[PDB]
Ligand binder design. Sequence first.
Ligand SMILES: Cn1cc(-c2cc3c(N4CCN(c5ncccn5)CC4)ncnn3c2)cn1
Length: 293
Amino acid sequence: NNYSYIDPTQLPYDHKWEFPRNRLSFGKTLGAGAFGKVVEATAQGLIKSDAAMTVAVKMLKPSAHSTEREALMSELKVLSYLGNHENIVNLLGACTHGGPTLVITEYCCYGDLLNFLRRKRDEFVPLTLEHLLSFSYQVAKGMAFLASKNCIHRDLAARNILLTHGNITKICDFGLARDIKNDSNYVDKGNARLPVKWMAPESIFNSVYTFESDVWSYGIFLWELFSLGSSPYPGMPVDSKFYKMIKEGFRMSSPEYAPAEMYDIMKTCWDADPDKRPTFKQIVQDIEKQISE
Ligand SMILES: Cn1cc(-c2cc3c(N4CCN(c5ncccn5)CC4)ncnn3c2)cn1
């Protein structure tokens, strides 16, 4: 009782982040949910006093219920605790009065990697394989950073990797990210729609989320990447047969453009035994070896 894990969501909001909402000009909607939406916006004087910059702004709709309002604040506090990293969509500011809560993050000008791969699919040549290895490395580095902070993301997928200048990929959407603190896992108590084809079996069957279940989803991400944006498990709807096959050990085959060593990572990320999956640290070092060779 004299020592405890500091819950980042119990910490005070740090007003160092506060930014006046009247200096934001909202534009295109980038995504929407039951919480509200994310929009592109211009922020006047956010980093430099006399300069405008493009940001993304996540906003609660005025009708948001208590469940969604405190979820957005919790997300803000998790991002504040995680700190800056090159391979995540970083927190830049927040607006916590004058209207609904707003969370201001970096804007990634090339949008999500799933649509990017689908746009570039027709003109891909072995967009090149070098780009795909880079994206695989950068996402592993982002996730290794999250795991090093005792956090899990719980919706890792190509649709939640964004691309910005310099071919830099950033992990986005931390609405479900959790510090697992003392429990070493997270049992989800919600009742929302779930990304079934990206989930580890123990998450589907027992609602348990761990470092190892994030690694399962990374394996699925890799399959999306090297198939140039195909939907996973083609020709298999989510139904009784899907769950039985996954439980019995069915796995996707190697994508057309995956190097053998990258499919090897995929297969280990999809081990039925969570303990036999690699860590993100191990994945980074493996892909590092592949790049240098
Ligand atoms: C066509 N195009 C789209 C972009 C784009 C999208 C984002 C972006 N998000 C964060 C996650 N989002 C979200 N959606 C629903 C629920 C929760 N989160 C929406 C997307 N964040 C930062 N930059 N950025 C740039 C550029 N071109």
